[PDB]
Ligand binder design. Structure first.
Ligand SMILES: CC(=O)N[C@@H]1[C@@H](O)[C@H](O[C@@H]2O[C@H](CO)[C@@H](O[C@@H]3O[C@H](CO)[C@@H](O[C@@H]4O[C@H](CO)[C@@H](O[C@@H]5O[C@H](CO)[C@@H](O)[C@H](O)[C@H]5NC(C)=O)[C@H](O)[C@H]4NC(C)=O)[C@H](O)[C@H]3NC(C)=O)[C@H](O)[C@H]2NC(C)=O)[C@@H](CO)O[C@@H]1O
Ligand code: NA
Length: 528
């Protein structure tokens, strides 16, 4: 077949490239032939493309499991059958426990291998299902998008829409989260995203005014679906925006398919989707891990017997076609701190794209102005318009000033008649004004001829016209080098004629003493 893409709603189902997988509740997922997958799965994702052995190098590939007892030619024939029915068959990249680790420069080879596989098997696109370390490993976040742009562009040349989808686990979809480079680099290139709303336990989101709604909360499942979808399709509540026409809700087929996330009561999904439709934002479909689980058995060897497609196929297909959200995007805008009098350029680092991923950076406009010569906050708003839609985003610029620092102003003791230079070892600096030593004045003097304690007040003047100032005080004590009688000690014993220094005076013992303080023994006592 040819490249077969989906224009309307989708029910996506992963297909296991292996047999008899064990379920989270002890069930079993048989391998199944593609031609047996229920027709209402209009996108079927071959799982998985990955590195099958590092002796083949870093570029991942796909190798059909022969125990499924499809020859290569037969597998190709069943893909062609699905394509003849207008269904798409994508190759899923990654999966659980698949490590992929690419280096900048691997993008040409990855693209070449994607195309090779696509042309050989009849695949219609590729699903990004990077998990754990593979999301962020080495240069993956650059290489994988770059490769896929090439692949898209290669098939566009012949008028074919090579589909690109992704299956991020929903916790990675916060605004600056690990999947964000894939989503932003491929804006305009991807057909839809089918996040996983399973296996995340008690993770979820905080709804200001209703509380924490967890993915494992079966009492609040309607609210979970509604609010996490509402946040995603509007870029609110700290989630990255995925337009509603491009959001497909991923679910486990049953309790064996994933540890948590199974919808016990399909009504909760019907109602959440209906609510989303009611505010003008119908979703694009559902996704499931997996067709094999939908055709599998539980631990008691009872058949699941297609309960997932029974619950969701007709509901999702019997909907109007999607309506494209053509809002443009802005990238690069972050509140920024700028030091007083530095240069600031409000356009550097900021870019914009239309909904098809075309660069429209030159079309951005900015209102507001920053005055880097005055500390304070300044608010800018960036705007861009395309396709009769407009996106805006604020940016706070804070102008701040840093105090200079003195060095060398430490209390010190010097000997009588020594030379003392109050500026010796003293400096000031500032990060932007540089050496400010010449801006320091000294109030007070030290007289090194006269024993005593001398205070010096250092002032630094800085800033515009030197009208800012800071002060620091220093004590310089001048001590004699004159040797004197040893200080009186309260525990020492003295005898007649012994002399001691105490309380600034020299005293002479008149007889035996221990523990009597000089100066306190009166007109006629032991110390005189
Ligand atoms: C206490 C609490 O609430 N804790 C929370 C955490 O649980 C949670 O973090 C998640 O933690 C779970 C493990 O507890 C971790 O689980 C993986 O989930 C991924 C994503 O769904 C699973 O991968 C997909 O799901 C199916 C299985 O449901 C995968 O199917 C398997 O595929 C392999 C081949 O690749 C086969 O060998 C297997 O047989 C097959 N399994 C089955 C049953 O068929 C499929 O490959 C994946 N892709 C898709 C499209 O479905 C992965 O299997 C789960 N691993 C395990 C060991 O169970 C999940 O990834 C953690 N999430 C994160 C973000 O790290 C956090 C989340 O914030 O919150 C709490 O802390
Ligand atoms: Na095809």
């Amino acid at each position: 077949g040819t490249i077969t893409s989906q224009d309307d709603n989708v029910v996506v189902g992963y297909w296991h490239n292996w047999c008899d997988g064990r379920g989270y509740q002890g069930g079993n997922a048989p391998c199944v032939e593609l031609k047996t997958v229920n027709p209402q799965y209009n996108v079927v994702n071959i799982s998985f493309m990955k590195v099958y052995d590092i002796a083949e190098g870093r570029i991942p590939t796909f190798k059909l499991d022969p125990t499924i007892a499809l020859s290569e030619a037969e597998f190709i024939a069943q893909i062609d059958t699905l394509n003849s029915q207008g269904r798409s068959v994508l190759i899923a990249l990654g999966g659980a426990d698949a490590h992929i680790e690419l280096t900048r420069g691997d993008e040409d080879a990855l693209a070449a291998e994607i195309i090779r596989l696509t042309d050989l098997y009849g695949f219609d696109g590729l699903d990004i299902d990077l998990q754990q370390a593979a999301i962020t490993a080495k240069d993956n976040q650059f290489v994988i998008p770059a490769a896929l742009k090439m692949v898209k562009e290669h098939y566009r040349k012949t008028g074919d829409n090579f589909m690109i989808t992704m299956a991020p686990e929903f916790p990675y979809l916060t605004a600056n989260g690990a999947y964000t480079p894939y989503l932003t680099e491929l804006d305009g290139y991807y057909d839809f995203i089918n996040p996983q709303f399973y296996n995340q336990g008690g993770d979820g989101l905080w709804i200001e005014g209703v509380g924490w709604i967890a993915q494992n909360n079966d009492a609040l499942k309607e609210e979970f679906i509604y609010y996490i979808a509402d946040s995603l399709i509007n870029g609110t509540r700290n989630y990255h925006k995925i337009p509603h026409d491009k959001l497909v809700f991923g679910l486990p087929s049953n309790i064996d398919a994933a540890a948590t996330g199974y919808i016990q009561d399909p009504q909760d999904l019907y109602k959440a989707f209906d609510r989303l439709k009611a505010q003008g934002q119908p979703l694009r479909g559902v996704m499931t891990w997996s067709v094999n689980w939908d055709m599998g058995t539980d631990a008691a060897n009872n058949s699941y017997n297609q309960q997932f497609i029974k619950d969701y196929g007709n509901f999702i297909h019997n909907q109007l076609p999607p309506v494209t959200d053509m809002t443009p995007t802005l990238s690069g805008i972050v509140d920024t701190r700028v030091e007083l009098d530095s240069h600031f350029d409000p356009l550097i680092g900021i870019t914009a794209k239309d909904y098809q991923g075309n660069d429209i950076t030159a079309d951005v406009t900015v209102s507001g102005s920053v005055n880097t010569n005055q500390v304070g906050d300044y608010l800018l708003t960036y705007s861009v318009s395309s396709d009769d839609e407009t996106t805006n985003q604020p940016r706070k610029i804070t102008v701040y000033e840093i105090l200079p620092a003195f060095t060398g102003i430490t209390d010190t003791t010097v000997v009588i008649d020594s030379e003392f230079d109050p500026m010796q070892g003293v400096s000031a600096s500032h990060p932007t004004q540089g050496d400010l030593t010449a801006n320091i004045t000294v109030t007070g003097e030290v007289d090194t001829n006269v024993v005593g304690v001398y205070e010096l007040t250092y002032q630094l003047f800085y800033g515009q016209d030197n009208q800012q100032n800071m002060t620091d005080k220093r004590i310089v004590t001048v001590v004699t080098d004159a040797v004197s009688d040893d200080d009186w000690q309260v525990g020492s014993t003295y005898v007649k004629d012994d002399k001691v220094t105490h309380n600034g005076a020299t005293w002479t013992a008149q007889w035996w003493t221990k523990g009597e303080e000089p100066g306190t023994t009166g007109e006629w006592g032991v110390w005189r």
